[PDB]
């Protein structure tokens, strides 16, 4: 019946424009990679690029936008 309430608000704010200005930047990074460590000498790369920074940006905005509105609904 009731789903995880945090999962609902977490899912809602991913459909605002300071939500997708952070989703896309996180991804196209996730594209751009793929190739960026697929290729040759990868086990032999010196620095392989990742995406924790842009994930963190998305999950910082989303959390401190969802923090003051959750415990109103959790019993």
């Amino acid at each position: 019946e009731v789903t995880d309430q945090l999962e609902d608000l977490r899912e809602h704010f991913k459909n605002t424009e300071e939500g997708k200005a952070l989703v896309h930047h996180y991804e196209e990074c996730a594209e751009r990679v793929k190739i960026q460590q697929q290729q040759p000498g990868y086990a032999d790369l010196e620095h392989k690029e990742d995406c924790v920074e842009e994930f963190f940006h998305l999950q910082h905005y989303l959390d401190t936008a969802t923090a003051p509105r959750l415990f109103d609904k959790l019993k």
């Binding site: 995880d4 995406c51 924790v52 910082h60 923090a67």
Partner: protein
């Protein structure tokens, strides 16, 4: 350090016990102990909490006597020096799953799960970090991070990789009072129970501090009144000079 090696900042949730006049919600403590017994206690100990301290806080005396008797404790040896066992009593402490550190690491792929009696006070962030950890495991790790085999990603742990896997999921516990046992609901009640385990004087302390701050605040204002009265002669005293004759 980078932000990953530090960890993600925990947010500020609106806990019902935050405030100088607030108490713990004791129905959330009672529900929280049920989540501990049925989910956490398989691999975590609670060595610093005794059975008797639950009476009058989350459970009745008759309830706690029956929970303790379901465990066996070492008795003193018999008339011939052979060891005995006995059931639990109220003066006993809550037992843990493992007998030593080697058996704990063996059952968790080398890692050791910490005792939780003081985990709210022994971590930066407090209850906001414990809640955000349990509810923070993503679906996929972010593309690029290479986890070892046997580790799980969630960004609230420093480094990004933690030896614990997600253990909370919807409707695994059936609450006695009819609350929907969603993931967030159980996480909230767990953290509230654990904060009581660390600070069992929270409610008495906040009420004795109301008495002490009211008394000392009025003494401070009375002392300012009394001083300015006893100093009024010196503050308005006046001086006059008439140059004498330098005969002397």
């Amino acid at each position: 350090m980078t932000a990953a090696e530090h960890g993600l900042h925990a947010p500020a949730y609106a806990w019902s016990h935050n405030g100088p006049f607030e108490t713990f919600d004791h129905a959330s403590i009672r529900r929280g102990y049920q989540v501990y017994r049925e989910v956490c206690a398989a691999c975590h100990s609670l060595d610093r909490v005794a059975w008797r301290t639950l009476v009058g806080v989350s459970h009745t005396n008759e309830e706690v006597r029956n929970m303790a008797e379901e465990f066996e404790y070492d008795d003193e040896p018999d008339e011939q020096g052979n060891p005995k066992k006995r059931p639990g009593k109220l003066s006993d402490y809550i037992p843990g799953p493992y007998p030593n550190e080697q058996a704990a690491r063996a059952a968790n792929q080398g890692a050791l799960p910490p005792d939780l009696s003081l985990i709210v006070k022994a971590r930066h962030g407090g209850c906001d970090y414990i809640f955000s950890l349990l509810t923070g495991y993503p679906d996929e790790p972010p593309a690029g991070v290479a986890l070892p085999p046997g580790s799980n990603y969630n960004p609230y742990f420093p480094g990004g990789s933690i030896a614990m896997a997600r253990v909370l999921f919807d409707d695994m516990v059936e609450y006695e009072d009819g609350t929907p046992a969603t993931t967030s609901q159980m996480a909230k009640d767990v953290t509230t129970f654990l904060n009581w385990c660390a600070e069992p004087e929270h409610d008495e302390r906040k009420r004795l501090g109301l008495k002490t701050v009211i008394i000392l605040s009025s003494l401070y204002l009375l002392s300012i009144w009394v001083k300015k009265f006893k100093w009024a002669g010196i503050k308005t005293r006046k001086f006059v000079f008439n140059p004498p004759k330098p005969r002397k």
